[PDB]
């Protein structure tokens, strides 16, 4: 499922990401734009067994188990296929686990390189919450 910017925002806000650890809502929408271009089916193989899954691209060696990655930690105690759904819940819950603080969105290089420092709020302006 490919989300709209406003629809993705509303779902994120409904799940408690708006101002989570002090990160305003636009950060999350901007991260999703760059990580999976708003696509819940997104996937990406890395130069190591690991693959990143879903809307926020969660890694298979550290967060979700894909039962195929060598050295998987499964810190979100969830199967990577769970992260490939149209309901963002499982993805929002693991990301909340990943962002343990006010610097935690660095867990996403795209956010760090393409969002951080820019008017991320431009992504939610004009959206019904």
């Amino acid at each position, epitope marked *: 499922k490919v989300f709209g910017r406003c629809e993705l925002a509303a779902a994120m806000k409904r799940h408690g990401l708006d101002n989570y650890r*002090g*990160y*305003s809502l636009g950060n999350w929408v901007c991260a999703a734009k760059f990580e999976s271009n708003f696509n819940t089916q997104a996937t990406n193989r890395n130069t190591d067994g690991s693959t990143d899954y879903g809307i926020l691209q969660i890694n298979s060696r550290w967060w979700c188990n894909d039962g195929r990655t060598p050295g998987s930690r499964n810190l979100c105690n969830i199967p990577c296929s769970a992260l490939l759904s149209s309901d963002i819940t499982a993805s929002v819950n693991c990301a909340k686990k990943i962002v343990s603080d006010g610097n935690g969105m660095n867990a996403w290089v795209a956010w760090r390189n393409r969002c951080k*420092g*820019t*008017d991320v*709020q431009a992504w939610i302006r004009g959206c019904r919450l």
Partner: antibody
Amino acid sequence: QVQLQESGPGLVAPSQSLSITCTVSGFSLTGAGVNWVRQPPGKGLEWLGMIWGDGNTDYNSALKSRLSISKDNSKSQVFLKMNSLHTDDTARYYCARERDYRLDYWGQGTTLTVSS
Amino acid sequence: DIVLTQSPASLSASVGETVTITCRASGNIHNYLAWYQQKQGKSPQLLVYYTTTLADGVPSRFSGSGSGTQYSLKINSLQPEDFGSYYCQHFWSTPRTFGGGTKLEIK
């Protein structure tokens, strides 16, 4: 340690063009925006403009045509330039770091006086 | 632009009292509102951001609230070091504007 320090001329005639510098440290200019604010003697805070981490700039509607903000990421300096000076431009000038929609760190300010 | 109307202009209070400063926005700012404290001869200091979030190091006696267009800063059991000026600022799009300031002084 995040630090912001302003440097400026102190006194200027309308016959000149004002430039103030904001040297920062402790953080990168690519990942944070820097705002410019002034406070006239015994007055409140007035927002002048800003430069985003990406280099885009936004300005105060009334002051737009007299202001120009730019920066040098390698020198870690942000600049405010202003022309058509008036006695009303006399104030203390501040640069402040913007981190996700809040000015969390401020410079000490430089005082400017516009002569005759 | 969105203008912010802050009241009251000054407030005289005693230590231990609870006060409230308000800022009303001319347009919906959707919670993008911060509060700053400025003591005599110092530069502004962030207190609260995103309407209710306290800056690190800021004491719990401060709390903000509001939505849409009316926002409040409440100070409970105000202490000697709380005296000074207070300003609100909105961050909804650009240009950003500040409230006119409130001077909190000793009774």
